[PDB]
Design a protein around this ligand. Sequence first.
Ligand SMILES: O=CN(O)CCCP(=O)(O)O
Ligand SMILES: O=CN(O)CCCP(=O)(O)O
Lengths: 398, 398
Amino acid sequence: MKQLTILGSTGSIGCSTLDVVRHNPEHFRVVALVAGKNVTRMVEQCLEFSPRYAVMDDEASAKLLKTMLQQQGSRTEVLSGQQAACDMAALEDVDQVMAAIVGAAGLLPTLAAIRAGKTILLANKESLVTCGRLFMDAVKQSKAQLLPVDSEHNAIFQSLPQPIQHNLGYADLEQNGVVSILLTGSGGPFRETPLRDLATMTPDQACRHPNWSMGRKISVDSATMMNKGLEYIEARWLFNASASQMEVLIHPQSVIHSMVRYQDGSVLAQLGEPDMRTPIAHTMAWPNRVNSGVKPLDFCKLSALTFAAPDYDRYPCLKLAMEAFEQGQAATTALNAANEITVAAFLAQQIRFTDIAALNLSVLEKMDMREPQCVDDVLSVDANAREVARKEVMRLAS
Amino acid sequence: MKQLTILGSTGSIGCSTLDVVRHNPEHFRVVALVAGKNVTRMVEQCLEFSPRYAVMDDEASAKLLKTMLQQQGSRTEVLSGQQAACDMAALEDVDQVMAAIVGAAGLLPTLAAIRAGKTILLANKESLVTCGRLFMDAVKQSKAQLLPVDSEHNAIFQSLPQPIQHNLGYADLEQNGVVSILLTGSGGPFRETPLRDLATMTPDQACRHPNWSMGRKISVDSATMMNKGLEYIEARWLFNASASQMEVLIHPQSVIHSMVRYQDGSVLAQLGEPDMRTPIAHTMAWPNRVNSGVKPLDFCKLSALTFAAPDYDRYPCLKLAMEAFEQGQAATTALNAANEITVAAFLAQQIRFTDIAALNLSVLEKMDMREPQCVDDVLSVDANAREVARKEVMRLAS
Ligand SMILES: O=CN(O)CCCP(=O)(O)O
Ligand SMILES: O=CN(O)CCCP(=O)(O)O
């Protein structure tokens, strides 16, 4: 049996993970849950799965949680704060850590799992994006295996040969017959919205994906295709791909999740319901398989599958991300940080949908700092870009 | 370097194989070519690749070939007949045998390659279909590895886990996380032809596939979906799949070549240009890859990808094949044999398109023989069904 620390347990991916545990009680045990402020969701999960430990980011949420747990008589112990999360990620009995915190705040707990040599179920793209080569070196240095949970990188992983799967980020694509990695592709809810209407789209419209049901941050990123931008950066580290070994396609139907192009002309792809339980279950059971709760994809009830090149006038954030990778790690760390601040500002009705790409661009220009040489440098660049992004947001606020 | 005997070299798959050798002269050498009666094509191939040996099925064709080769001064030696083909398949220096003869006539040379422990690039579905468990036992008994060349089984193979790839036909699908195998799917050139017009379709119309450019036999089988019927039978042996582990879909665009359904909801698929060089190159280079001459699939210039359940009123041959597998090996051997005779009769303008399924059904009913216990029994059943099918054809001739 394999035992779990879930980072970001109350989130969309966290809840999907627990649903896989739920369907496979004889294969998977949760030792620790880590979350932020959603106390009701966390109390549901603690009462259901009886984890050894539960961590909340702030102490007030931890107290509310503990009060309810000791009333019901739960054996689950409650802690709070970032260091507690890092300790939960490194517990001896833990085999796998689901890294599903949103944003760069997930970085330190994820790195702690990595240093403890844990199998990392990686669903926190912002951490690899913001940390890059330093993240990949921490993985190589330790006994840890990365297993991509994000739907796209998971599909790529499944469609890659074993020498790459077993040496992720360090193996040579070309020697293993890989020509390129095909990153798809939904296009968001406004793929067919007139360009000139984009600025009037509300947070609720942006968070309503036709196919996916995920968190608000990721839904907005899908709308701007910053999600694909972040995944483009991440895929380059995870799979050791150059710019010429990356293609980005829009696939509106979200059936194909991504693909790998080989030298003989073959393209290998993963398909399925747009449901995170599938890629999560893939990583948790790898190299075997388990039921994930997701039913068989019915090919006779599908929409016709299409593809299209991304239009950078529609999706300026994609351009920003792809070019940030070329500009280096400081620009990338700062882009991620800015986008966290501007997406939050959009969701809090402080700026418009199209202001995200505008202010992200502005922050990048105003950033003037050196390439990070360590994790502390990554965090200084992050914190600084957050400060500049907050100032820029105030630039377009009522 | 790997060295080749090609069985059926002058055919569509044979020519596609030689094109892969052509693009990879430093990886692949042809020791022997085996063909039938197409002397011009065979002389082209002998003069180009300078094989050690060339075999033609009849002695008159061998003579015409030899006359031209010794005029030009070629070192290639010419032989004729079936036993010669079997010897070519077992030469010491041969590493791989492309089994690309059409029909059950390919059986004996393919079995000779198998007994010699050769890597079998298997593109002769009629042989496995007609020989079944006996074929798979010959493979298991010897040192031979099957590598499926047919576009569909190749796609399945690429989309299967390594434990299955390395123990093909004997490994358990369910233990390796496989729920089912999804066999696709073109539907032929008459997929959208009114049912009532099918009977007026000519051989030239039947042989014009929108996507594939292959031999006449396989093109007619694609039109009736007997191709899928034969591939259904073959896939059950190759992948150790039961009836409940097989799904058959129409995919009109021939981009997806087939798929594998896993327990967590994942579906793995191979995609590409509908071009046999790709699956051929996959098998020849396995577990590595080579350029096959096929260019990268352009997803931005594709038709929208669709799927549909097969309609047995449109494709009665599919029903015949799927039910023949249940009826056992004699019925299957006899169905294949009948279909070879009736497809030939259709191409020779002796019967109509729709007469293929009718006479195939008739032959099956008239067959009354025991399940084959050995290869000789397989050939008696085959020869007998050919005789009955010829008689039935005469039933509807002018
Ligand atoms: O893990 C799943 N995702 O990343 C969501 C994909 C939505 P997009 O294709 O619009 O980025
Ligand atoms: O190897 C390639 N084929 O089998 C040709 C497929 C044509 P179909 O899908 O109509 O059977």
